[PDB]
PDB file of C-alpha atoms in Angstrom:
ATOM      1  CA  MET A 243       0.000   0.000   0.000  1.00  0.00           C
ATOM      2  CA  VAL A 244       1.072   3.585  -0.664  1.00  0.00           C
ATOM      3  CA  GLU A 245      -0.517   6.398   1.358  1.00  0.00           C
ATOM      4  CA  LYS A 246      -2.275   9.220  -0.555  1.00  0.00           C
ATOM      5  CA  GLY A 247       0.052  12.234  -0.897  1.00  0.00           C
ATOM      6  CA  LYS A 248       3.209  10.136  -0.631  1.00  0.00           C
ATOM      7  CA  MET A 249       5.937  10.969  -3.146  1.00  0.00           C
ATOM      8  CA  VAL A 250       6.586   8.005  -5.427  1.00  0.00           C
ATOM      9  CA  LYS A 251       8.751   7.519  -8.491  1.00  0.00           C
ATOM     10  CA  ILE A 252       7.103   5.341 -11.141  1.00  0.00           C
ATOM     11  CA  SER A 253       7.953   3.680 -14.430  1.00  0.00           C
ATOM     12  CA  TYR A 254       5.230   2.720 -16.887  1.00  0.00           C
ATOM     13  CA  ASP A 255       4.493   1.441 -20.376  1.00  0.00           C
ATOM     14  CA  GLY A 256       1.107   2.208 -21.905  1.00  0.00           C
ATOM     15  CA  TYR A 257      -0.580   0.223 -24.665  1.00  0.00           C
ATOM     16  CA  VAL A 258      -3.665   0.857 -26.824  1.00  0.00           C
ATOM     17  CA  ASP A 259      -4.948  -1.842 -29.201  1.00  0.00           C
ATOM     18  CA  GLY A 260      -1.814  -3.910 -28.497  1.00  0.00           C
ATOM     19  CA  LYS A 261       0.552  -1.066 -29.411  1.00  0.00           C
ATOM     20  CA  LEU A 262       2.866   0.898 -27.119  1.00  0.00           C
ATOM     21  CA  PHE A 263       1.804   4.567 -27.180  1.00  0.00           C
ATOM     22  CA  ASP A 264       3.639   5.938 -24.121  1.00  0.00           C
ATOM     23  CA  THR A 265       6.586   4.886 -21.935  1.00  0.00           C
ATOM     24  CA  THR A 266       9.077   6.197 -19.386  1.00  0.00           C
ATOM     25  CA  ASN A 267      11.637   3.748 -20.842  1.00  0.00           C
ATOM     26  CA  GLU A 268      13.745   5.431 -23.553  1.00  0.00           C
ATOM     27  CA  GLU A 269      15.201   2.119 -24.810  1.00  0.00           C
ATOM     28  CA  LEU A 270      11.745   0.550 -25.164  1.00  0.00           C
ATOM     29  CA  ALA A 271      10.555   3.693 -26.969  1.00  0.00           C
ATOM     30  CA  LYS A 272      13.334   3.333 -29.561  1.00  0.00           C
ATOM     31  CA  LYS A 273      12.678  -0.399 -29.862  1.00  0.00           C
ATOM     32  CA  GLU A 274       8.959   0.240 -30.422  1.00  0.00           C
ATOM     33  CA  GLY A 275       9.478   3.283 -32.709  1.00  0.00           C
ATOM     34  CA  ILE A 276       7.847   5.932 -30.484  1.00  0.00           C
ATOM     35  CA  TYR A 277      11.012   7.667 -29.244  1.00  0.00           C
ATOM     36  CA  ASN A 278      10.615  11.430 -28.948  1.00  0.00           C
ATOM     37  CA  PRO A 279      13.872  13.472 -28.738  1.00  0.00           C
ATOM     38  CA  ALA A 280      11.868  16.215 -26.971  1.00  0.00           C
ATOM     39  CA  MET A 281      10.710  13.887 -24.158  1.00  0.00           C
ATOM     40  CA  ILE A 282      12.570  13.424 -20.879  1.00  0.00           C
ATOM     41  CA  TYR A 283      12.511   9.683 -20.141  1.00  0.00           C
ATOM     42  CA  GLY A 284      13.100   7.885 -16.851  1.00  0.00           C
ATOM     43  CA  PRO A 285      10.852   7.412 -13.797  1.00  0.00           C
ATOM     44  CA  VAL A 286       8.200  10.064 -13.066  1.00  0.00           C
ATOM     45  CA  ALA A 287       7.786  11.587  -9.604  1.00  0.00           C
ATOM     46  CA  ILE A 288       4.152  11.864  -8.487  1.00  0.00           C
ATOM     47  CA  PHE A 289       2.283  12.274  -5.275  1.00  0.00           C
ATOM     48  CA  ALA A 290       0.163   9.132  -4.830  1.00  0.00           C
ATOM     49  CA  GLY A 291      -3.563   9.644  -5.534  1.00  0.00           C
ATOM     50  CA  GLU A 292      -3.089  13.327  -6.442  1.00  0.00           C
ATOM     51  CA  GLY A 293      -4.284  13.129 -10.071  1.00  0.00           C
ATOM     52  CA  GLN A 294      -0.993  13.585 -11.971  1.00  0.00           C
ATOM     53  CA  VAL A 295      -1.585  10.271 -13.763  1.00  0.00           C
ATOM     54  CA  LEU A 296      -4.687   8.567 -15.220  1.00  0.00           C
ATOM     55  CA  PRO A 297      -7.341   7.826 -12.555  1.00  0.00           C
ATOM     56  CA  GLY A 298      -6.867   4.044 -12.877  1.00  0.00           C
ATOM     57  CA  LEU A 299      -3.099   4.415 -12.484  1.00  0.00           C
ATOM     58  CA  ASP A 300      -3.467   6.466  -9.290  1.00  0.00           C
ATOM     59  CA  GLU A 301      -5.904   3.829  -8.027  1.00  0.00           C
ATOM     60  CA  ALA A 302      -3.458   0.985  -8.709  1.00  0.00           C
ATOM     61  CA  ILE A 303      -0.503   2.876  -7.172  1.00  0.00           C
ATOM     62  CA  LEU A 304      -2.313   3.293  -3.832  1.00  0.00           C
ATOM     63  CA  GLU A 305      -2.769  -0.515  -3.659  1.00  0.00           C
ATOM     64  CA  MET A 306       0.834  -1.270  -4.634  1.00  0.00           C
ATOM     65  CA  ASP A 307       4.029  -1.888  -2.678  1.00  0.00           C
ATOM     66  CA  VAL A 308       7.310  -0.098  -3.344  1.00  0.00           C
ATOM     67  CA  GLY A 309       9.223  -2.191  -5.921  1.00  0.00           C
ATOM     68  CA  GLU A 310       5.986  -3.834  -7.114  1.00  0.00           C
ATOM     69  CA  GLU A 311       5.344  -4.107 -10.820  1.00  0.00           C
ATOM     70  CA  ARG A 312       1.896  -4.966 -12.096  1.00  0.00           C
ATOM     71  CA  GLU A 313      -0.201  -4.695 -15.217  1.00  0.00           C
ATOM     72  CA  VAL A 314      -3.494  -2.821 -15.214  1.00  0.00           C
ATOM     73  CA  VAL A 315      -6.342  -2.678 -17.726  1.00  0.00           C
ATOM     74  CA  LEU A 316      -8.260   0.592 -17.617  1.00  0.00           C
ATOM     75  CA  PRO A 317     -11.688   1.298 -19.110  1.00  0.00           C
ATOM     76  CA  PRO A 318     -12.134   4.728 -20.786  1.00  0.00           C
ATOM     77  CA  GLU A 319     -13.635   6.271 -17.626  1.00  0.00           C
ATOM     78  CA  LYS A 320     -10.458   5.440 -15.677  1.00  0.00           C
ATOM     79  CA  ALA A 321      -8.128   6.304 -18.568  1.00  0.00           C
ATOM     80  CA  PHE A 322      -8.477   9.239 -21.002  1.00  0.00           C
ATOM     81  CA  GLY A 323     -12.232   9.475 -20.403  1.00  0.00           C
ATOM     82  CA  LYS A 324     -15.337   8.337 -22.206  1.00  0.00           C
ATOM     83  CA  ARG A 325     -15.806   9.983 -25.595  1.00  0.00           C
ATOM     84  CA  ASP A 326     -18.190  12.762 -24.520  1.00  0.00           C
ATOM     85  CA  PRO A 327     -20.851  13.789 -27.127  1.00  0.00           C
ATOM     86  CA  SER A 328     -20.961  17.280 -25.573  1.00  0.00           C
ATOM     87  CA  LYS A 329     -17.344  17.751 -26.777  1.00  0.00           C
ATOM     88  CA  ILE A 330     -18.307  16.935 -30.360  1.00  0.00           C
ATOM     89  CA  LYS A 331     -19.498  20.266 -31.739  1.00  0.00           C
ATOM     90  CA  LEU A 332     -20.905  21.774 -34.922  1.00  0.00           C
ATOM     91  CA  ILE A 333     -19.053  24.885 -36.191  1.00  0.00           C
ATOM     92  CA  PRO A 334     -19.810  26.908 -39.362  1.00  0.00           C
ATOM     93  CA  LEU A 335     -17.397  26.349 -42.231  1.00  0.00           C
ATOM     94  CA  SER A 336     -17.713  30.138 -42.591  1.00  0.00           C
ATOM     95  CA  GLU A 337     -15.791  30.686 -39.345  1.00  0.00           C
ATOM     96  CA  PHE A 338     -12.817  28.563 -40.458  1.00  0.00           C
ATOM     97  CA  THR A 339     -12.523  30.334 -43.848  1.00  0.00           C
ATOM     98  CA  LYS A 340     -12.867  33.750 -42.159  1.00  0.00           C
ATOM     99  CA  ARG A 341      -9.788  32.731 -40.143  1.00  0.00           C
ATOM    100  CA  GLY A 342      -7.866  31.482 -43.194  1.00  0.00           C
ATOM    101  CA  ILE A 343      -8.100  27.836 -42.161  1.00  0.00           C
ATOM    102  CA  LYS A 344      -9.152  25.189 -44.677  1.00  0.00           C
ATOM    103  CA  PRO A 345     -11.092  22.520 -42.785  1.00  0.00           C
ATOM    104  CA  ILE A 346     -10.292  18.987 -43.937  1.00  0.00           C
ATOM    105  CA  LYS A 347     -11.743  15.721 -42.634  1.00  0.00           C
ATOM    106  CA  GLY A 348      -9.164  14.144 -40.284  1.00  0.00           C
ATOM    107  CA  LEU A 349      -7.398  17.464 -39.627  1.00  0.00           C
ATOM    108  CA  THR A 350      -6.483  18.419 -36.055  1.00  0.00           C
ATOM    109  CA  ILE A 351      -7.416  22.044 -35.392  1.00  0.00           C
ATOM    110  CA  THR A 352      -7.038  24.242 -32.310  1.00  0.00           C
ATOM    111  CA  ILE A 353      -9.840  26.562 -31.108  1.00  0.00           C
ATOM    112  CA  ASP A 354      -8.969  28.888 -28.203  1.00  0.00           C
ATOM    113  CA  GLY A 355      -6.013  26.600 -27.411  1.00  0.00           C
ATOM    114  CA  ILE A 356      -8.170  23.458 -27.406  1.00  0.00           C
ATOM    115  CA  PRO A 357      -7.245  20.710 -29.896  1.00  0.00           C
ATOM    116  CA  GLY A 358     -10.049  19.167 -31.968  1.00  0.00           C
ATOM    117  CA  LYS A 359     -10.301  16.671 -34.800  1.00  0.00           C
ATOM    118  CA  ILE A 360     -12.601  17.352 -37.756  1.00  0.00           C
ATOM    119  CA  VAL A 361     -15.107  14.466 -38.019  1.00  0.00           C
ATOM    120  CA  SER A 362     -16.972  15.654 -41.111  1.00  0.00           C
ATOM    121  CA  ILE A 363     -17.777  18.617 -43.322  1.00  0.00           C
ATOM    122  CA  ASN A 364     -21.288  18.660 -44.808  1.00  0.00           C
ATOM    123  CA  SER A 365     -23.118  21.633 -46.363  1.00  0.00           C
ATOM    124  CA  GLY A 366     -21.208  24.301 -44.412  1.00  0.00           C
ATOM    125  CA  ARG A 367     -21.285  22.401 -41.094  1.00  0.00           C
ATOM    126  CA  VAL A 368     -17.949  21.259 -39.629  1.00  0.00           C
ATOM    127  CA  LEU A 369     -18.290  18.596 -36.932  1.00  0.00           C
ATOM    128  CA  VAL A 370     -15.274  18.739 -34.567  1.00  0.00           C
ATOM    129  CA  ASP A 371     -14.443  16.218 -31.837  1.00  0.00           C
ATOM    130  CA  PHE A 372     -12.623  17.997 -29.020  1.00  0.00           C
ATOM    131  CA  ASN A 373     -12.311  14.826 -26.904  1.00  0.00           C
ATOM    132  CA  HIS A 374      -8.881  13.398 -26.075  1.00  0.00           C
ATOM    133  CA  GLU A 375      -7.455  11.370 -28.963  1.00  0.00           C
ATOM    134  CA  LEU A 376      -7.687   8.223 -26.821  1.00  0.00           C
ATOM    135  CA  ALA A 377     -11.090   8.987 -25.248  1.00  0.00           C
ATOM    136  CA  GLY A 378     -13.367   5.942 -25.349  1.00  0.00           C
ATOM    137  CA  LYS A 379     -10.399   3.548 -25.527  1.00  0.00           C
ATOM    138  CA  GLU A 380      -9.424   0.728 -23.208  1.00  0.00           C
ATOM    139  CA  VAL A 381      -5.756   1.001 -22.307  1.00  0.00           C
ATOM    140  CA  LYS A 382      -3.291  -1.390 -20.685  1.00  0.00           C
ATOM    141  CA  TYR A 383      -0.324  -0.284 -18.586  1.00  0.00           C
ATOM    142  CA  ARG A 384       2.621  -1.951 -16.982  1.00  0.00           C
ATOM    143  CA  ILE A 385       3.402   0.081 -13.885  1.00  0.00           C
ATOM    144  CA  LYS A 386       6.207  -0.167 -11.327  1.00  0.00           C
ATOM    145  CA  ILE A 387       6.844   1.782  -8.148  1.00  0.00           C
ATOM    146  CA  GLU A 388      10.614   2.372  -8.339  1.00  0.00           C
ATOM    147  CA  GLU A 389      10.833   4.152  -4.975  1.00  0.00           C
ATOM    148  CA  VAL A 390       8.908   5.965  -2.266  1.00  0.00           C
ATOM    149  CA  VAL A 391      10.443   9.208  -1.018  1.00  0.00           C
ATOM    150  CA  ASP A 392       9.633   9.253   2.715  1.00  0.00           C
TER     151      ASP A 392
END
């Protein structure tokens, strides 16, 4: 068990549809072809149960021992969230063209700093999904508590 608020350093590998999409392990990232030169790899310091990681990860961490490694399967609600219909919004084509942006199906756009993916364009109506890319997805993580500070 790890008490809520306790500083812990964790390592993790995250998978969606059987594919690694995130990892603290630089070597694994290169091996799996997701290495990002702009990312700082290595264990991540969190406070246990304080919401710095996905809800289901925080939940698992509180149950875990220092040095424990386990795998966890998280439903959307405990991962990147359910795909919320209220975040899928209709916007006039007119407003994109006014702003010199050509809407294209599949294109990621940013409104007021918020990223959104264009679902469709039909008769001047642009449907944009502002949900997280992985919303509605089951994810699987390997997670290890490397150390507890305190």
